[PDB]
């Protein structure tokens, strides 16, 4: 046999978007949350 | 309702046929049967594919 014919590593691109979605899903709208970021300086 | 459509999609999956292609062909034939007052049954043919 040879080649691949499976691209399934593509699911990582969708999975990487699922993590960003869950972060920005909570703060959407007037009922959302106020996020805080700290650099350390 | 969506769980009952896996059986016709499974028969065409083992043969390598597109389960979405054979699904749209059956729905197109059922639309013409609803207009007429007759009764005609539609089924999936695995040999020909239609």
């Amino acid at each position: 046999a040879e080649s691949l014919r499976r691209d399934a590593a593509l699911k990582v691109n969708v999975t990487s978007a699922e993590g960003l979605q869950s972060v920005l899903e909570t703060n959407l709208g007037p009922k959302g949350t106020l996020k805080m970021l700290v650099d350390g300086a | 309702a969506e769980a009952l459509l896996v059986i016709p999609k499974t028969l065409v999956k083992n043969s390598g046929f597109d389960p979405l292609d054979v699904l749209a062909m059956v729905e197109d034939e059922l639309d013409d049967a609803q207009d007429s007052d007759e009764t005609r049954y539609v089924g999936v043919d695995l040999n020909i594919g239609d």
Binding site: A1, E2, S3, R5 | G16
Partner: protein, 142 residues
């Protein structure tokens, strides 16, 4: 195959089919195993090509019926079943061939002579069987 230890159970499938050739016709065991092994190699390219194994099985069934119909047109000669010492030399020669070299000329007259002794005189009669598998015994001496 009976003296070898089989690990993978898929190997026993070809072993069971090989024993069928020895029990009934008794000849061609090497033709069955080698041909069955090559059908898997040509089918391996179809798997990588994307062709499903379902249509591959259906393709062999259509090709098998076409081959059996052509076997009747490929017949050259017809054995008269004369059971003559010289006539049996044509069937026995290829059997001894491809096994042991140099003994095909000597063993041709020894085997063909023992067959004509156990067979009676008859023609065009297939109702009553005559030749059995135990009629020929092989002994050895130093």
């Amino acid at each position: 195959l009976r003296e070898l230890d089989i690990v993978h159970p898929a190997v026993k499938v070809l072993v069971m089919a090989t024993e069928q050739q020895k029990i009934d016709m008794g000849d061609g065991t090497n033709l069955v195993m080698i041909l069955a092994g090559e059908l898997l190699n040509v089918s391996e390219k179809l798997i990588s090509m994307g062709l499903s194994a379902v249509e591959i099985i259906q393709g062999y069934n259509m090709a098998r019926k076409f081959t059996l119909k052509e076997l009747d047109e490929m017949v050259v000669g017809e054995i008269t079943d004369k059971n003559d010492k010289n006539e049996l030399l044509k069937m026995i020669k290829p059997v001894i061939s491809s096994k042991k070299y140099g003994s095909e000329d000597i063993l041709s007259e020894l085997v063909s002579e023992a067959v004509s002794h156990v067979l009676p005189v008859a023609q065009q009669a297939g109702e009553i069987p005559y030749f059995n598998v135990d009629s020929i015994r092989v002994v050895k001496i130093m």
